[PDB]
Design a protein around this ligand. Sequence first.
Ligand SMILES: CCOc1cc(C(=O)N2CCC(N3CCN(C)CC3)CC2)ccc1Nc1ncc2c(n1)N(C1CCCC1)c1ccccc1C(=O)N2C
Ligand SMILES: CCOc1cc(C(=O)N2CCC(N3CCN(C)CC3)CC2)ccc1Nc1ncc2c(n1)N(C1CCCC1)c1ccccc1C(=O)N2C
Length: 112
Amino acid sequence: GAASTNQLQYLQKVVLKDLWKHSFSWPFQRPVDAVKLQLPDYYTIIKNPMDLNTIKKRLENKYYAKASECIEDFNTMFSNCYLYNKPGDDIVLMAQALEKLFMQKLSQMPQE
Ligand SMILES: CCOc1cc(C(=O)N2CCC(N3CCN(C)CC3)CC2)ccc1Nc1ncc2c(n1)N(C1CCCC1)c1ccccc1C(=O)N2C
Ligand SMILES: CCOc1cc(C(=O)N2CCC(N3CCN(C)CC3)CC2)ccc1Nc1ncc2c(n1)N(C1CCCC1)c1ccccc1C(=O)N2C
């Protein structure tokens, strides 16, 4: 699928890179460390943990056949943050800014 491969390349080379270099992205660059953060319930409440490194590795290993599968993982990462945390939390403020950037860059993904 040439079109799907081109869209996945855009997600890897543009969207992922733009989120990664954003100054708020660091908490999302590795899976949540429930021990370090003292969150003994995180991996019970969050049923599909997700982070930018997991997405990066999936792109690198050709894990996705379609762009929608990769977009789903970005959406899960943000959704998880909002499910576990509370309005007004530092991480929720960071996530909202990152998600705005995500939507902007995603809207420029080639459509055909
Ligand atoms: C592997 C390292 O990991 C962490 C380290 C540190 C840390 O002290 N360093 C790191 C940043 C350093 N600077 C800051 C930027 N500077 C411009 C350059 C260098 C200085 C000190 C803090 C949190 C970490 N890890 C985490 N990973 C997921 C989450 C997460 N923290 N946050 C916090 C991130 C900050 C707001 C809250 C959560 C906390 C509680 C519950 C959930 C979540 C949550 O949802 N996420 C996604
Ligand atoms: C912030 C802007 O907002 C969007 C706008 C437009 C748009 O109108 N055009 C038409 C005009 C195009 N220009 C404008 C400048 N110029 C002068 C030349 C013409 C730009 C694109 C499309 C998607 C948007 N924003 C979005 N935000 C989250 C999602 C999202 N689209 N997609 C789509 C983006 C990639 C494929 C699907 C979703 C769609 C349905 C269900 C879920 C999701 C989903 O998961 N996400 C995360």
